[PDB]
Design a protein around this ligand. Structure first.
Ligand SMILES: [Cl-]
Ligand SMILES: [Mg+2]
Lengths: 231, 235, 241, 222, 250, 240, 243, 244
């Protein structure tokens, strides 16, 4: 109310409203899902268009050969943050000849978002990210919020109506965690998960976006006729 | 007052949303993409009859393979065009090739959110970026001050946009010829324009793989206007 | 009324942020006292440790700024430690630049100048503290100099600071009216500490155990704080007279 | 632009079937003056890597502090610091190699020749060289300074190519290293009799031997 | 972080007033009275030493300050603001004059430099004006004796005699009756003590009054001998005893 | 440094600081530009609430940017000096690098770009100035007249006016200027310009300034008597 | 009024309301504790299991500074990470110049001054965390607790978060019943009990226990996480006491 | 942050005026009147001191009239402290030109630059403008004798006769009435004093409430002399014209 003019102001109950308003931009964004087994990690994203004459806004971005994310909210902010991750993954390779741990990737994103919440003039990032990767400790899935909070999960979903997929994955936990050495089945589980967040619209060929990374699979994105297999 | 980079309670940036209103006040610009080329047309809209209309420059070349049309606070576009031209030429210097239309558009859109307390406010102008490259062929992009860009088969921006866009929804198909697209831009511009459309208050342009980006003469557009009127009377 | 939020003048020529910083001074509810002997300068302050979970040895408002200078603070501990660190740094730099130990009064002036800047410059708030500096200066002898958030400073024959400062002040005034001198006419610092505690007891009207007090003593070439058992030894001596 | 003051001489090393061996004497020379005798020039990083350094000792001590700091920094927010995300020899090398080449490119080098010896997580032997110029290379045997001229020829008789590595035991390898150290004491005017030797094996791990002496010397023949 | 206040805190109001300067002058009005009188062969500046506590040693707090050997200053208003102005004034006399010309600045020019510092606190970003009025008395070879007043705005005026602070209105009227262009320095000291007694309420002695003169050169206060051209400071602070001697023949 | 974003969007999509800068232009004295078949004429109003002026030394309303291009304006006088100075410096810089004087279009494009930059830079307000820029391109006899405004937009005009009561004189020019046949001579062009100012000015005495620019750096300012003859001639034909 | 709209502004009381508002964010957070023992310190924290989908043991909250200091905090988690990042910079520069690892009291003031600095200007926000931290140095064991205002003291036991009062009461009993001292292994078990007892104040979602410790004898003066058999043993001890 | 306390000194009103400039002009209208009159053989500068006290040292005083170089002077109306900042800048600027070109600076060039500095404070920097209006009186070999005025907006204009400060409206009317082009210096001296005497807010115009100066070619052959009048000389010129 009187305490939402900027990020540098606390409310009387200890809330940061500008951070909460940034969180709201994620809720308006199109749904995206993340889940993993012990061998692979999978992103599934519903893309959004302006109208029937327009393209469908791309949701998934590659960060390295072993890492990448999906976005929900302000896309330019995702471009800034993904670019930062690309650099950090790259610094780790050039300097230490070491693939950046997915956990450190999370810690770095947390600290970059935080600085924008404690200083005058700046603003919080207006996007949520789901980071998947495969490193020296196996498959991983992370959830980034622009408050700074990063969380490691077996599965999750962010965006509009993400609660449907999040409940489904919570039920399916014991099943999909043991889909080891089978990519097409782990994707099927993710495509079934995102279907629990659909209303009036269904998954078409230029609407669905899938990404996968794993033990013997580089981070690769599938669009167009390559996702027809899963509809 | 309040911060320039402040979020609204609905999760939108006030200044970006307000700049979108400035663009709705701008003159109409239309783009249509075909397999034979992309057409770009604009309403000039002279504020007075004494103003020499051919000095109104709302369609602009970025490179030989990329053109651009604008709508809104058109003075804001100058530095965007300057950046686009430099980006296009610089890439050709670094890589001995033409830069992709999408990569150009992304470079322009990177400027958009570089405001706050960097420039003092967002841009008050929307751009239609049309071009060709070997990988993805003929392309049309709509670049906004939000930093977002969508690819379009056809798109209208400005005061007559929502009415023109609904018209483009019906008329566009994947087999349109270049000549068919030219007439379609003229037709839809004549519908949404205030004053009566002629060769002096409207301007056409296109980009083809063979001849590159070309702004049409007033004589050439005049004949397309005459060809359009005759065809509508013929049924 | 934004003239009450930053350090600009109000219509009546006042600086409210400076005035409110003075009120932060008493936020700890602790009283301090400083007196001078022939050879020494004694400073005493109340020590209140309410929480049983606290480590009492880490609760302190007296600081050893340099080998010769000590400083007691009246105000919140964060601002107190901020002032202490700066004073330590300033005293260290002075010695390096000018080849002799920074006098108590000069450090007082310097810290007072820094405080003055916060009353004039907008982006910096005043510190909510009153700093009492003590030493046995090699030129001026036993010295007490005190700084506040307004940037004011002055030397003292003796002084007191805190919520019940006025009672202690008049108690000391009345003694110096009687004795007719500028100091405690005593040989040992032990009895000057005893005087300081005795007159604080009379003014405040409370009895003190060994853990209710905190004592700093400045002699020629060193300032030191007393332990609980040093104070207990001092409390026993007062009781047996 | 520098000039080295207190210096350390040869560092020698080789691969064998299960791991790597590395050695260096305990001397800190000050020109012709053999000034310091308790200088350790092999520095272990974790339980899987040993970095051997020759050249300027002040710069060696700086590199010690960098490696010490690298272990600290790697442990930060890292639950697998003593497991899958422990520092590999290859990581430690690439870091040092980066630093060396950056310093040469700023015309202010770290005046050293460095050999990183260790065993990777998959059991593979690691042995690679880097110097003040930022020049890097790998070989079944590696040596610095005089070692390059006198030790390498001897160590190459045991392991002349890649296929000789499986055929070489730790007993045979250590024998060759210890012999090479004796030869260096005979012939290098800046060597000492006292030295340290480290074995990094994929089965038995890191064995660090201190206060070794050159013995069984032939002089009786003037 | 960093000083984000890069804008003026003193601005013109619709009526044309500069609010912060006006309010600074109000702070000066509240301040204790100080005065200055110019004689033919000297200048006297005086003020009351308002003690904060009887336990305080008022000798350690100096309201009258030496700026150069021939220039002194006194004030009315906020003490801390005055203290830092004296520090800055002493330094600027060296940096912008003595280090260039090898001699001390004439009164009018040092006054001009202090005025500049006070003007900048009225226009620069993120600062309030100084809450003091200064009276600066001094001597120099080509201008003789002079007395200046410097206000929070940065304006300065030369005076034959004047007062500032608490009871300045009455004190100025008193000085108008007594001042003539033939006053000798001792006569000006006498009038200064008379004028000050009107504004002082409590004790009136050498311990509660602070008084200095700009007069003859004092070779005894120089600290060395051998250079004929160097003859000593014209600034001298009167002692507590010297004031009491003149209070008997009052 | 002072950073504040002073020019910002409002809910309806307007930048008020830019629009308020246009109000300053509306307050300024009237300025008019008319181009003929072989010349451009710049006319300017001077308010007569100022007697006891010294016209020798008072800043003239029409300024030479180079020997072949001139700039007049309406709005804040102090602001205009900054634009004129920058333009004059760019004029010499262009001659230095390109080895050719500026085109009137280029000089206009530069001045307009400066004005635009002050609408989305922190810590600055827009220029309270609109300009008329007239002249002839190097080795060209085609007349050029351009207009700029605080927002940064610029365009070419056959004839145009800016300042107070400019809407009245624009009305006059819109019916009295034939595109098919522009003023064929210098006399015709000056007369049409003086006529248009007489719709708004008051007395044709020391209130009107006229500057004529012809091809190849041929710029001259008319004196009182010369202008007064046009005023005298127009009034006698009017009484009919 | 309006005195609470800007950081570093004194109210007429002499208070900085923005700091007091940051304290509210801390009180909203999960419970964390610190127990000082014979020759070291023990840290523990409550981790709310929001969903089945959270990977157990893999969202670590306790952080190490240098090799001998542990830090845990309640409130805005990102703010705590920023403070630890600074703590690591401060500890590194101390060790760089002075060789010896940073003493705990020295480290405490480094964090204190830094947090206090974020109450001096309106262009920064105060920290939304209270931080419990400590370790072993040359003078033995030290436990500290640091608050948004910059205020810190040494503690026998410390607690912060939503269940601070429950945990404080339980801490006071240990201080009274063990005047001679508590052992390191005992303090680990007690830490588990107190987190379980303090969980009553946050009992909608069930939780995950996380413990760490520094001890001169048990961990050789270095910071280590309690895992496996020692953790399960401490969990079982806590489970037996709630029933 | 600090946005809360920003006055925004460099913005436009809805009507297209600069608030702070307008308010600074309002301040200047209360300052003592200053008049400049340009004759064919010289220039007069006359100014009224702000309500004087009898104990003010009148001879060693300077408030209104300042010397910029040997050929140029200024009359001040507004804050004196502000004016001295600008005067020192102007003095330095004149010396820069002399050092660069070995010629005394033309009057307009000095006036333009000082006015350009004032302009800057109204367009950028977020600081308050200088509350000062100048009358420039000077001579150079291009235009001869010249009068200019500048104000807080940074706008400057040239004049045959002009007033600044208080009662300019009444003063300008009186000057417009009695001024003619063939006027001499001694006539202009009389006009200046007569105008102040009629526009003054005081009871009667006396020597101690005036500063006076002339810029003549009344030296010896083709060179210009600046005369800042002493107290006694103002007393005499006031008697000579019969005002006292
Ligand atoms: Cl200082
Ligand atoms: Mg302040």
């Amino acid at each position: 109310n009187n305490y939402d003019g900027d990020t540098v102001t606390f409310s009387p109950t200890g809330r940061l409203f500008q951070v909460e308003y940034a969180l709201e931009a994620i809720k308006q964004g199109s749904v995206t899902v993340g889940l993993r087994s012990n061998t692979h990690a999978v992103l599934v994203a519903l893309k959004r268009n302006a109208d029937e004459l327009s393209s469908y806004q791309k949701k998934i971005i590659k960060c390295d050969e072993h890492m990448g994310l999906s976005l929900a909210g302000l896309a330019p902010d995702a471009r800034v943050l993904s670019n930062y991750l690309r650099q950090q993954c790259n610094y780790s390779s050039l300097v230490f000849n070491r693939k950046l741990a997915v956990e450190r990737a999370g810690h770095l994103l947390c600290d970059k978002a935080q600085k924008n919440t404690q200083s005058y003039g700046g603003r919080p990032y207006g996007v949520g990210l789901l980071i998947i990767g495969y490193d020296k400790s196996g498959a991983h899935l992370l959830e980034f919020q622009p408050s700074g909070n990063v969380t490691e999960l077996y599965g999750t979903a962010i965006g509009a109506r993400s609660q449907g997929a999040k409940t489904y994955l919570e039920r399916t936990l014991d099943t999909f965690i043991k889909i080891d050495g089978n990519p097409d089945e782990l994707i099927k589980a993710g495509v079934e998960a995102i279907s629990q967040s659909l209303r009036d619209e269904s998954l078409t060929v230029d609407n669905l976006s899938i990404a996968i990374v794993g033990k013997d699979t580089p981070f690769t994105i599938y669009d167009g006729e390559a996702v027809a297999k899963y509809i | 007052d309040r911060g320039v980079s402040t979020f609204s309670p609905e999760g939108r940036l006030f200044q970006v949303e307000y700049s979108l209103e400035a663009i709705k006040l701008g003159s109409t610009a239309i783009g249509i993409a075909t397999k034979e080329g992309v057409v770009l047309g604009v309403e000039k809209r002279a504020t007075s009859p004494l103003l020499e209309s051919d000095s109104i420059e709302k369609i602009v070349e970025i490179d030989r393979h990329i053109g651009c049309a604008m709508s809104g606070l058109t003075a804001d576009a100058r530095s965007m065009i300057e950046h686009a031209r430099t980006a296009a030429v610089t890439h050709n210097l670094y890589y001995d090739e033409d830069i992709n239309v999408e990569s150009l558009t992304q470079s322009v859109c990177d400027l958009a959110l570089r405001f706050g307390e960097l420039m003092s406010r967002p841009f008050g102008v929307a751009l239609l970026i049309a071009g060709h490259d070997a990988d993805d062929g003929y392309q049309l992009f709509h670049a906004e001050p939000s930093g977002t860009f969508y690819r379009y088969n056809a798109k209208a921006i400005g005061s007559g946009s929502e009415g023109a866009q609904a018209e483009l929804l019906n008329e566009w198909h994947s087999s349109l010829t270049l000549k068919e697209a030219e007439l379609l831009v003229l037709k839809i511009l004549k519908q949404v324009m205030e004053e009566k459309l002629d060769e002096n208050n409207a301007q056409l342009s296109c980009i083809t793989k063979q001849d590159g980006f070309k702004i049409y003469d007033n004589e050439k557009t005049a004949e397309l206007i005459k060809e359009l009127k005759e065809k509508e009377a013929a049924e | 009324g934004y003239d009450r939020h930053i350090t600009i003048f109000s219509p009546e020529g006042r600086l409210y942020q400076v005035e409110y910083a003075f009120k932060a001074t008493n936020q700890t509810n602790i009283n301090s006292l400083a007196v001078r002997g022939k050879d020494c300068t004694v400073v005493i302050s109340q020590k209140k440790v309410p929480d049983k979970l606290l480590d009492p040895t880490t609760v302190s408002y007296i600081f050893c700024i340099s080998r010769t200078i000590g400083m007691v603070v009246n105000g919140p501990i964060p601002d107190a430690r901020n002032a202490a660190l700066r004073a330590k740094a300033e005293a260290a730099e002075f010695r390096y630049k000018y080849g002799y130990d920074m006098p108590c009064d000069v450090l007082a002036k310097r810290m007072a100048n820094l405080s003055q800047i916060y009353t004039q410059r907008a982006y910096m708030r005043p510190l909510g503290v009153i700093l009492t500096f003590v030493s046995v200066d090699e030129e001026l002898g036993p010295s007490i100099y005190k700084t506040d958030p307004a940037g004011y400073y002055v030397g003292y024959k003796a002084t007191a600071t805190g919520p019940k400062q006025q009672e202690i002040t008049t108690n000391l005034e009345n003694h110096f009216k009687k004795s007719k001198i500028d100091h405690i006419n005593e040989e040992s610092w032990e009895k000057v500490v005893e005087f300081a505690i005795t007159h604080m007891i009379d003014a405040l009207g409370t009895e003190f155990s060994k853990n209710d007090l905190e004592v700093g003593v400045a002699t020629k070439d060193k300032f030191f704080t007393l332990s609980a058992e040093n104070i207990e030894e001092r409390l026993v001596a007062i009781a047996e007279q | 632009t520098q000039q080295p003051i207190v210096t350390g001489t040869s560092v020698i090393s080789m691969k064998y079937d299960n791991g790597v061996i590395i050695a260096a004497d305990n001397l800190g020379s000050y020109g012709s003056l053999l000034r310091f005798n308790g200088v350790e020039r092999l520095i272990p990083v974790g339980d899987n890597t040993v970095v051997g350094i020759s050249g300027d000792i002040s710069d060696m001590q700086h590199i010690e502090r960098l490696l010490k700091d690298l272990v600290t920094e790697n442990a930060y927010d890292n639950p697998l610091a003593d497991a899958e995300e422990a520092l590999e020899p290859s990581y430690i090398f690439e870091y040092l190699a980066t630093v060396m080449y950056q310093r040469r490119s700023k015309m202010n080098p770290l005046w050293n020749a460095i050999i990183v010896a260790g065993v990777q997580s998959n059991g593979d032997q690691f042995l690679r060289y880097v110097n003040l110029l930022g020049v890097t290379y790998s070989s079944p045997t590696l040596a610095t300074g005089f070692g390059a001229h006198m030790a390498n020829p001897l160590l190459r008789k045991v392991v002349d190519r890649e296929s000789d590595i499986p055929k070489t035991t730790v007993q045979v390898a250590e024998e060759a290293i210890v012999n090479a150290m004796r030869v260096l004491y005979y012939r290098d005017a800046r060597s000492s009799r006292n030295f340290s030797l480290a074995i990094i094996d994929k089965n038995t791990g890191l064995t660090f031997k201190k206060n070794l002496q050159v013995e069984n010397m032939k002089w009786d023949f003037a | 972080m960093t000083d984000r206040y890069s804008f003026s805190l003193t601005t013109f109001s619709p009526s044309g007033k500069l609010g912060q300067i006006d309010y600074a002058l109000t702070a000066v009005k509240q301040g204790v009275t100080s005065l200055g009188i110019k004689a033919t062969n000297g200048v006297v500046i005086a003020t009351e030493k308002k003690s904060s506590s009887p336990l305080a040693m008022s000798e350690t707090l100096s309201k009258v300050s030496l700026l150069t050997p021939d220039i002194g200053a006194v004030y009315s208003g906020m003490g801390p603001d005055y203290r830092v102005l004296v520090d800055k004034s002493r330094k600027v006399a060296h940096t912008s004059y003595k280090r260039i010309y090898g001699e001390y600045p004439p009164t009018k020019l040092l006054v001009s430099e202090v005025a500049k510092i006070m003007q900048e606190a009225t226009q620069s970003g993120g600062v309030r004006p100084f809450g003091v009025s200064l009276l600066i008395a001094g001597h120099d070879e080509f201008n003789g004796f002079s007395l200046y007043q410097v206000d929070p705005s940065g304006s300065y005026f030369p005076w034959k005699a004047t007062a500032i602070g608490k009871g300045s209105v009455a004190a100025k009227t008193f000085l108008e009756k007594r001042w003539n262009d033939e006053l000798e320095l001792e006569d000006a000291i006498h009038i200064a003590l008379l004028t000050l007694k009107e504004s002082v309420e409590g004790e009136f002695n050498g311990d509660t009054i602070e008084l200095a003169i700009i007069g003859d050169e004092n070779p005894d206060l120089l600290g060395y001998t051998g250079i004929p051209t160097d003859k000593g400071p014209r600034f001298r602070k009167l002692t507590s005893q010297e004031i009491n001697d003149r209070l008997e023949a009052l | 440094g002072y950073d504040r974003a002073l020019s910002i969007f409002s809910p309806d999509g307007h930048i008020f600081q830019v629009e308020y800068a246009l109000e300053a232009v509306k307050r300024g004295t009237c300025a008019v530009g008319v181009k003929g078949k072989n010349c451009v004429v710049l006319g300017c109003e001077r308010r007569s609430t100022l007697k006891l002026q010294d016209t020798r030394i008072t800043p003239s309303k029409v300024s030479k940017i180079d020997s072949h291009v001139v700039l007049s304006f309406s709005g804040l006088n102090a602001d205009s000096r900054i634009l004129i100075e920058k333009a004059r410096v760019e004029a010499q810089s262009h001659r230095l690098t390109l080895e050719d004087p500026v085109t009137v279009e280029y000089l206009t494009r530069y001045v307009a770009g400066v004005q635009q930059r002050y609408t989305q830079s922190g810590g600055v307000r827009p220029f309270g100035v609109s300009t008329l820029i007239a002249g002839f391109d190097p080795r060209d006899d085609e007349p050029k007249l351009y207009q700029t405004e605080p927002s940064g937009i610029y365009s070419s005009w056959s004839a145009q006016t800016i300042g107070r009561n400019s809407k009245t004189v624009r009305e006059f020019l819109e019916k009295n200027y034939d595109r098919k046949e522009p003023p064929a001579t210098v006399e015709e062009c000056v007369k049409l310009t003086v006529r248009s100012l007489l719709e708004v000015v008051q007395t044709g005495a020391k209130n009107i300034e006229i500057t004529v620019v012809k091809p190849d750096s041929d710029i001259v300012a008319l004196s009182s008597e010369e202008i007064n003859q046009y005023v005298t001639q127009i009034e006698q034909e009017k009484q009919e | 009024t309006g005195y609470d709209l800007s950081n570093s502004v004194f109210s007429p009381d002499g208070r900085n309301f923005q700091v007091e508002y940051a304290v509210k964010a801390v009180e909203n957070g999960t419970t964390s504790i610190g127990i000082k023992c014979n020759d070291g310190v023990v840290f523990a924290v409550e981790k709310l299991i929001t969903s089945k989908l959270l990977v157990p043991q893999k969202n670590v909250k306790i952080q190490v500074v240098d090799r001998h200091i542990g830090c845990v905090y309640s409130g805005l988690i990102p703010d705590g990470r920023h403070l630890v990042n600074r703590g690591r910079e401060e500890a590194a520069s101390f060790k760089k110049l002075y060789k010896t690892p940073i003493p705990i009291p020295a480290f405490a003031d480094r964090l204190g001054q830094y947090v206090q600095a974020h109450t001096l200007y309106n262009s920064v926000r105060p920290f939304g965390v209270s931080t419990i931290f400590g370790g072993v140095d040359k003078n033995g064991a030290h436990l500290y607790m640091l608050e948004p205002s910059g205020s810190y003291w040494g503690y026998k036991g410390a607690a912060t978060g939503k269940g601070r009062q429950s945990a404080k009461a339980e801490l006071e009993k240990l201080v009274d019943h063990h005047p001679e001292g508590l052992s390191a292994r005992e303090a680990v078990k007690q830490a588990a009990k107190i987190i379980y007892l303090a969980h009553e104040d946050n009992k909608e979602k069930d939780f995950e226990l996380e413990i760490s410790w520094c001890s001169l004898s048990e961990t050789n003066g270095l910071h280590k996480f309690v895992k496996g058999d020692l953790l399960q043993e401490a969990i079982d001890f806590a489970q037996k006491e709630i029933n | 942050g600090s946005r809360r306390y920003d006055s925004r000194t460099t913005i436009f009103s809805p009507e297209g005026r600069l608030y702070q400039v307008e308010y600074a002009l309002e301040s200047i209208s209360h300052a003592g009147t200053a008049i400049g009159i340009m004759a064919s053989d010289g220039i007069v500068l006359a100014a009224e001191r702000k309500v004087t006290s009898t104990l003010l040292e009148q001879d060693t005083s300077t408030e209104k009239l300042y010397k910029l170089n040997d050929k140029i002077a200024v009359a001040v109306a507004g804050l004196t402290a502000d004016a001295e900042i600008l005067i020192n800048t102007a003095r330095i600027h004149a010396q820069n030109y002399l050092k660069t070109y070995n010629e005394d600076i033309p009057v307009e060039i000095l006036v333009r630059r000082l006015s350009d500095i004032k302009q800057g404070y109204t367009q950028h920097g977020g600081l308050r403008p200088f509350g000062v209006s100048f009358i420039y009186a000077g001579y150079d070999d291009r235009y001869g004798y010249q009068l200019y005025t500048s104000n807080p907006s940074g706008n400057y204009t040239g004049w045959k006769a002009i007033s600044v400060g208080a009662n300019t409206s009444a003063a300008q009317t009186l000057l417009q009435m009695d001024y003619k082009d063939d006027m001499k210096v001694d006539d202009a001296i009389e006009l200046a004093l007569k105008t102040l005497s009629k526009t003054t807010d005081s009871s009667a115009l006396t020597y101690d409430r005036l500063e006076f100066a002339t810029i003549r070619k009344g030296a010896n052959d083709g060179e210009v002399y600046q005369k800042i009048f002493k107290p006694q000389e103002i007393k005499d010129i006031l008697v000579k014209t019969g005002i006292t």
